[PDB]
């Protein structure tokens, strides 16, 4: 893959890639299409729009968008501009967008109608630097500051040129959480998903200009940008996009071609996704869809749903790990070399290393932790030297998984270095859910593990002391829960212990009840 040029910018590339199919549909939603021409359009006035509000390049914006065909206009238009998104999860809380706003100091935020009350509440609190609020869709009316986006676009005409960046200036952020603390702003540069998508999109999955894309994984997650953004964009590929929750049968509905008129060729998800779909009872049949590769990412792929699945539809799941980090894939099986139970190889244009406990060499077979060097791994940590010190090694990458290298050159996933879950393949903190149990007034004390469900796929499971004298049942702990937390971080049980398994010092051991203690 040659390197892109070192004046590039990452929107201005993906434009001119697809001039030759102006008429050929990007994207497609249920409600909306528009064609490469369409967006391109769209876009280059959004550009004009941001930079005509007074936002400079190199200024952020926030953009707190459900998938659909805005979305692409939104993040290719501050690009175009020279104006860095910071693309975010629309399952958030109010507090954790006012850290955004003041941590990113956005200078105007591009929403959905859907996600403005969230957005208000989180404006309200900060100390944020908001100068306009572009509302997607508005849902609700608008006031003094707030503009609805498509009267915000049609009103510019189209930027004349890009902005004069370079490849490693930055391009856009997208967060990341750890076990605690706030988000860390990765940053990304222009050049960053340039590689992802000819390392990944093309020379790995071998996506096509005739492929209809389609991806249960969000576009504000990485996984999901790459799927149904940089990469079908690299190709020229049609993507269709879905506002509302994956479930299967919102995901069935499209792959039978219920949206657009089209039938998903390439469909990308989490293994839970998958055992959910293959426990529906309206599981579509073969002849009933047009899918040609599978992908997946987000969990490892418990070897039992992708032979299912394979059974099944005749096509593997290929499962592959990349990092917010590291922008996309880096380790992965192929569409045509599937090991179920590994991860697969290394993705060609990557360096991977295991690294034991004194960043020492490990024998095949011996679990190290991750590390990778490749060409789309993120700068920093925006504002964390610390953070940022321990992640960006010289070159190298830690991702916080540990691995066993096999003799085949395949690797098998050993476990994280850091306490996070994989819970139906998203990051979850399991100090998170014990900091909410603890909140309730009959929970004397709780510790919450990772415990692998009926499909070998992990869950959170919250072992509680409840205070002796008030009655606590865990009825009443689901209810406290329900608006507290994502339902994905939903214990999937309770066990109430009358104590917990500690140090002499009284710190919990936490892996005690892993091996089952209690």
Known sequence: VTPPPEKFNFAEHLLQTNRVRPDKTAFVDDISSLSFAQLEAQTRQLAAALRAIGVKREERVLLLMLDGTDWPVAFLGAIYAGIVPVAVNTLLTADDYAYMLEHSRAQAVLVSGALHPVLKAALTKSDHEVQRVIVSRPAAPLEPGEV?????????????????????????????????????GVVHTHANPYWTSELYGRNTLHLREDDVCFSAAKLFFAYGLGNALTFPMTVGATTLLMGERP?????????????????????????????????????????????????????????????????????????????????????????????????????PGYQIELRGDGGG????????????????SATMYWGNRAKSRDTFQGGWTKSGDKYVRNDDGSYTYAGRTDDMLKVSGIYV????????????????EAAVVGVADEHGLTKPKAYVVPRPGQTLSETELKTFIKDRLAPYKYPRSTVFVAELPKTATGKIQRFKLREGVL
Do not use: C
């Not at 986006?149 to 967060?175: I, N, R, S």
């Not at 060499?361 to 789309?376: K, Q, R």
């Not at 903190?429 to 004397?444: D, K, M, R, W, Y």
């Open 148 to 184: 609805d986006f498509a009267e915000f676009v049609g009103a510019h005409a189209p930027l004349e040129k890009p902005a004069a960046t370079q490849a490693d200036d930055p391009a856009f952020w997208l967060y990341s959480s750890g076990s605690t603390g706030r988000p860390k």
């Open 247 to 347: 479930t299967p049968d919102a995901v069935f509905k499209r792959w039978l071609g219920g949206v657009g008129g089209v039938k998903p060729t390439v469909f990308y998800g989490a293994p839970t996704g998958y055992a959910g779909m293959l426990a529906a009872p309206n599981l579509p049949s073969r002849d009933q869809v047009a899918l040609r590769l599978a992908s997946s990412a987000g969990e490892a792929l418990p070897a039992e749903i992708g032979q299912r699945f394979q059974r099944h539809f005749g096509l593997d799941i290929v499962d592959g790990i990349g990092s917010t980090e590291m922008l996309h894939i880096f380790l992965s099986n192929l569409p045509d070399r599937v090991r179920y139970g590994t991860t697969g190889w290394p993705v």
């Open 361 to 376: 060499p490990v024998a095949d077979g011996e679990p190290g932790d991750l590390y990778i060097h490749g060409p789309s």
């Open 429 to 444: 903190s399991p100090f998170e859910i014990e900091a909410t149990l603890v909140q309730h007034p009959g929970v004397l």
